[PDB]
Amino acid sequence: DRWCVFDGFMVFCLWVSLVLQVFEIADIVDQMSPWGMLRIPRPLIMIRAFRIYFRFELPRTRITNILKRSGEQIWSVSIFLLFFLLLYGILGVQMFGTFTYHCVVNDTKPGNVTWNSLAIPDTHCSPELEEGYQCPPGFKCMDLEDLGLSRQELGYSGFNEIGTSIFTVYEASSQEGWVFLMYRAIDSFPRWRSYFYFITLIFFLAWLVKNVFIAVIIETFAEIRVQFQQMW
Amino acid sequence: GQCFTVESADAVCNLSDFYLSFCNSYTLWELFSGLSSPSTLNCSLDVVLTMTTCRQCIEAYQDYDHHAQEKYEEFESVLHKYLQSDEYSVKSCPEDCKIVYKAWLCSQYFEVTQFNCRKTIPCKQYCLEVQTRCPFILPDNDEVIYGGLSSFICTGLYETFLTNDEPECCDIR
Amino acid sequence: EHRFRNFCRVVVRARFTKYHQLYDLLGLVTYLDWVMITVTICSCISMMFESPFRRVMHAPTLQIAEYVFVIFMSIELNLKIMADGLFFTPTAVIRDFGGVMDIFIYLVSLIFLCWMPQNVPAESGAQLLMVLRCLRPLRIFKLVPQMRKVVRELFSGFKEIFLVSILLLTLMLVFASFGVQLFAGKLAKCNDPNIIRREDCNGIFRINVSVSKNLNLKLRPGEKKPGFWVPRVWANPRNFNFDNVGNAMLALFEVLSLKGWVEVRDVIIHRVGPIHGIYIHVFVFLGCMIGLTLFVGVVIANF
Amino acid sequence: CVIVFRFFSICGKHVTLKMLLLTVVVSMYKSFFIIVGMFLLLLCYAFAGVVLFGTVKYGENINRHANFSSAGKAITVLFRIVTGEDWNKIMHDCMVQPPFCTPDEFTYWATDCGNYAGALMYFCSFYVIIAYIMLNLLVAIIVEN
Amino acid sequence: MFILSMVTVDVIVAASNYYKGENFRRQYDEFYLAEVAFTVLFDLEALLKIWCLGFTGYISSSLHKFELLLVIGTTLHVYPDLYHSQFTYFQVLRVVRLIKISPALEDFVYKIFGPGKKLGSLVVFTASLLIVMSAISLQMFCFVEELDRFTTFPRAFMSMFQILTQEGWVDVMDQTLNAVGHMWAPLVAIYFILYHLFATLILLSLFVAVILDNLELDEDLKKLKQLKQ
Ligand SMILES: *[C@@H]1O[C@H](CO)[C@@H](O)[C@H](O)[C@H]1NC(C)=O
Ligand SMILES: *[C@@H]1O[C@H](CO)[C@@H](O)[C@H](O)[C@H]1NC(C)=O
Ligand SMILES: *[C@@H]1O[C@H](CO)[C@@H](O)[C@H](O)[C@H]1NC(C)=O
């Protein structure tokens, strides 16, 4: 299966790794350079280990047709998942803002944020008097963005724009780190919005859409069974 | 039993009527009876009636009280920032947690037997009181994950917490 | 001895084409079934207000709702027993697990109504009675043909589910014995990170209190992180320890859920050695990628 | 909202998207009764937890957000348990015992403690029944549709 | 039956060695002696079986091989040097023999595993993918400063396995994003997102499909059963 080019490229990668290690012995480069990324294709030689076990009783045409059908199904399901992710990201953008307001000690100055200034544990709030959690006496709700906070410490968590919202929706779909996101949304926004949004996201994306891939794989195995059975 | 807050070390050196500024449950009699500060480890209620030694011992006790007060201020600053102090428990109130923590801290910085106590309780048992009063505060787990251990704990694995020769200080709740 | 039994027999069986589906849905269950379903739903709604502060034993509305449910269920069960019998008739009230469950629920409700305790100690008989009473919404599983069909389909694969459970328990027992033999008392260390030897784990030390995991406020010119002074203790993680077979099995069961197993892995590596991480990795791969997969496969195959 | 509705409508102009959306909605219709059964079990366990752990002292995960003080809060916590939450920490918090809590000798709503074995059995049984059994039924329905 | 009872008693005694304190020998205690005795008993059993059925006859059973492997592992583990070490993994495996008590359980295990070649191929492919991805990531993030998840190969494998398990993979991705900076952040983020997508929506799905296929009756058997109707 055109393995000559693959083996030649593996030999080239071996040459590159050998000369890089020779330079390492020369101590010219302290090994902390990104040059080690040149070794990235080397583990691909493990594929050469299993080249023989990649042929079965099924002829080439049957395997190609099975793979084409599976790939088309996977592409369709991927398009469906992308559509759902875009829908939920748009809903999050238009239903939530930036989870930046926090309850802090009322004697706080901008550009002087301290870990001691935050509540224990740190929580969110809303400047509105009837939306979300309300800070107790001695604590006031503040933006914590005019105070000098940066995006790096806040990270990619939230619904700042379409990309951030889509990434957060995908993260929540894996049933990872969304309950705390739900608590933050409840603190920063009306309860019903958070409940409806997160319940729908979990029920659809985390249960239905994810299991659509399992259904596709099951159909792939059924097609494999059919091709195995109809060969003779 | 009238209040007598110790202010001047050089004022004096009957003997059970000197309440400390912060740990007001201890007197000079309570301190010189058993406690021995390492710097001047000769104050064992005998040299009192004769420091210079008495003055230095009193000043060291006051410094201990000051350090305990500072640590208690840190603790109450931490607790004040805890928003759920009004809902963490029904039988527990933050004031009770502060009082028991203060008692435990005074015990830690003064490990002696308090006399003239109407209610007798093992002094180390105050630690358990904190576990039974103060809310669960989640410690930081960046250097090393603590599992689910509380910030304040008293008993360890296969360890007898209560033992013999317990100081058994005063009981106040 | 026999008169007016036929009255109940006729009553308990009453039922009932543009909207044919609507007619069928209306005539799906008997009138007595509709009454029982409505009463059960009202009782569930009433219980949804049974907060610990708003105790049922004190709130008049919840008391009235419980009275209504108990009276109506007693009347329905008595009429059914009088009409269709109890045991002799093959299609009597007691015919399968559903009849037994309904009898149990009725007895629990009647006992609760008659007793009405004023003080329920923790882990006491009255608390268990209330917990059993909380099983009331299960009657909907018996009063609807679709729910009974779903329950029957699910219980069809009971033997396969039990066999997979036996395999999982065998795996858990093996790995729990391994963990007990290798880690008995070796997962406990001083809460103070700086102190290493157990002989020095005493006194007090200042500990940093967790504030926010999603914040990275690195500006600390001369300040210290929030925290306070606690005594040093040589203690177990309090969430998973291998001091006994039961604790090991519980910890492995928690790990199997793939919730917080990273904490267990880090604790094992830091407190035992990097070699033993192979143990937890193998356990996770053999249980989470197979055992849960086995359960999913057997349930899907049964369906 | 109007733009969102139109974007939802655009799914019907693509054959693959239309087929997948029909699959999802028909699977939901078929699994309606399974969802009802799951909700019934969740409600039963919510009542049980309210009776048991209604006054448990706040722990690692038990707070003003996740607690069994009210039936609605219990329902929400139970739903979140089987959907990617640290349920083991919740159970351990419900497994609090003295001297961590002040026991009461008269009533269960003033003890601030929890039933150790009760919490263990409750949480393990709930997770096994929901997260390991009926979700597989939902998966099977999805595959069928 | 006696062998099964001895296995059960031995494993129960071994698992009952609960922690009691730091003042216990754990080198010549009663539990070690009991392990020695049960290892001796099983060695005698294995030798007797080999004698009765012949060395070739015993080894040709195609299933006593695991029993002999456990015998060798327990014999090695009996030494104090290897006691309570990785070799203990062999000892606790003896409960596998207990699976012989129920023929129904053995039949269920064989059916749920079905053709062993297919499940073995799936497991081998999964392990190969894990190794390849771990090596690629390790070579990608070995030189990144203030980073610990991709320093050595074991740590890279642990990180990739954690991402596969979906528990805290977002934390790993966030740490990597903070470590790389801003210029390389979108690229590594896309790499991790693609890996997570592939893992979650391929590997577990293949596991489920293989399990169902093993449970699903063979097509020829299904046709035969339909014919008998
Ligand atoms: C910032 O906080 C520190 C700590 O209290 C204080 O000393 C300083 O004056 C503050 N500066 C400003 C500008 O708020
Ligand atoms: C902050 O709130 C506390 C609570 O009463 C109050 O004592 C203090 O004066 C406030 N500080 C302000 C408003 O700067
Ligand atoms: C608390 O944080 C500071 C700052 O990183 C650190 O130096 C200290 O060791 C931490 N506390 C403990 C008990 O490790």
Residue numbers in the entry:
A (entry chain C): 105 to 336
B (entry chain D): 188 to 200, 226 to 262, 267 to 389
C (entry chain C): 843 to 858, 873 to 1159
D (entry chain C): 1305 to 1449
E (entry chain C): 388 to 616
Q: Which passages does the manuscript contain on this structure?
A:
NALCN channel mediates sodium leak currents and is important for maintaining proper resting membrane potential. The functional NALCN channel is a hetero-tetrameric channelosome that is composed of NALCN, FAM155, UNC79, and UNC80 proteins, with a total molecular weight of 920 kDa1.
Further extensive signal subtraction and focused refinements resolved five overlapping structural fragments at 2.9–3.7 Å resolution. Our final model encompasses 1346 out of 1738 residues of NALCN, 173 out of 467 residues of FAM155A, 1528 out of 2654 residues of UNC79, and 1711 out of 3326 residues of UNC80. UNC79 and UNC80 interact in a head-to-tail fashion to form a plier-shape complex, akin to the infinity symbol “∞”. UNC79 and UNC80 interact through three regions: head, joint, and tail. We observed one C3H-type zinc finger between α26 and α27 of 80-UHD-M, and another C3H-type zinc finger between α46 and α47 of 79-UHD-M. NALCN interacts with UNC79-UNC80 heterodimer through three cytosolic UNC-interacting motifs (UNIM-A, B, C), which all are on loop regions of NALCN. UNIM-A has a short β hairpin structure which is inserted into a hydrophobic crevice formed between α48-α50 of UNC79. UNIM-B interacts with 80-UHD-M and 80-UCD2. Therefore, our structural observation and modeling study suggest that the binding of UNIM-C of NALCN DII-III linker to the UNC79-UNC80 heterodimer in the quaternary complex would prevent the binding of its neighboring CIH in the CIH-binding pocket of NALCN CTD, likely through spacial constrain, and UMIM-C-5A mutations would disrupt the binding of UNIM-C to UNC79-UNC80 and would release the constrain of UNIM-C on CIH to allow it to re-bind to NALCN CTD.
